[PDB]
Amino acid sequence: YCQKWMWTCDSERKCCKGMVCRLWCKKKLW
């Protein structure tokens, strides 16, 4: 699974595209 908006990511766990990978998955505003 890709990490959803209410999820978080890691070096392995990636957030779903459209969001940015960070401590938590954050929507790409920029």
Curated annotation (Swiss-Prot):
Segments for region (Flexible tail region important for ability to inhibit Nav channel): 26-30
Substitution effect: residue 12 to A: No change in binding affinity with Nav1.5/SCN5A. 5-fold increase in ability to inhibit sodium channel Nav1.7/SCN9A. No change in activity towards Nav1.7/SCN9A
Variant or mutagenesis effect after changing residue 26 to R: Small increase in ability to inhibit human Nav1.7/SCN9A. In K/R; 30-fold decrease in ability to inhibit Nav1.7/SCN9A, and change in ability to bind membranes
Keyword Nucleus in annotation: no
Domains: entry comment: The presence of a 'disulfide through disulfide knot' structurally defines this protein as a knottin.
Known outcome of mutating residue 22 to Q: Moderate decrease in ability to inhibit human Nav1.7/SCN9A
Annotated consequence of substituting residue 6 to A: At least 10-fold decrease in affinity with Nav1.5/SCN5A
Paired cysteines (S-S): 2-16, 9-21, 15-25
GO MF assignments: calcium channel regulator activity; lipid binding; sodium channel regulator activity; toxin activity
Family annotation (SUPFAM superfamilies): omega toxin-like
Entry similarity comment: Belongs to the neurotoxin 30 (phrixotoxin) family.
Site, as annotated: Electrostatic gating-modifier of Nav1.7/SCN9A that antagonizes outward gating-charge movement through direct electrostatic repulsion: 22
Outcome (variant: residue 3 to A): No change in binding affinity with Nav1.5/SCN5A
Additional remark text: The ability to inhibit Nav1.7/SCN9A is greatly enhances by unatural modifications such as C-terminal amidation (5-fold) or C-terminal addition of -NHCH3 (25-fold). Such modifications also improve the ability to inhibit Nav1.2/SCN2A, but the selectivity for Nav1.7/SCN9A over Nav1.2/SCN2A is retained.
Residues with site note (Part of an aromatic-rich surface that anchors the toxin toward the membrane core relative to lipid headgroups bound along the pore module of Nav1.7/SCN9A): 5, 7, 24, 30
Annotated site, Antagonizes outward gating-charge movement of Nav1.7/SCN9A through direct electrostatic repulsion, chain positions: 26
Compartments (UniProt record): Secreted
Tissue expression from the record: Expressed by the venom gland.
Effect of substituting residue 5 to A: At least 10-fold decrease in affinity with Nav1.5/SCN5A
GO cellular-component term (any): extracellular region
Annotated protein name in UniProt: Beta/omega-theraphotoxin-Tp2a
Free-text function comment from the UniProt entry: Gating-modifier toxin that targets voltage-gated sodium channels with a selective activity on Nav1.7/SCN9A (IC(50)=1-1.5 nM). It inhibits both activation and inactivation. For inhibition of activation, it is 100-fold more selective for Nav1.7/SCN9A (IC(50)=0.26-3) than for other sodium channels (Nav1.2/SCN2A (IC(50)=40-540 nM), Nav1.3/SCN3A (IC(50)=102 nM), Nav1.4/SCN4A (IC(50)=30-39 nM), Nav1.5/SCN5A (IC(50)=19-90 nM), Nav1.6/SCN8A (IC(50)=26 nM), and Nav1.8/SCN10A (IC(50)=146 nM)).
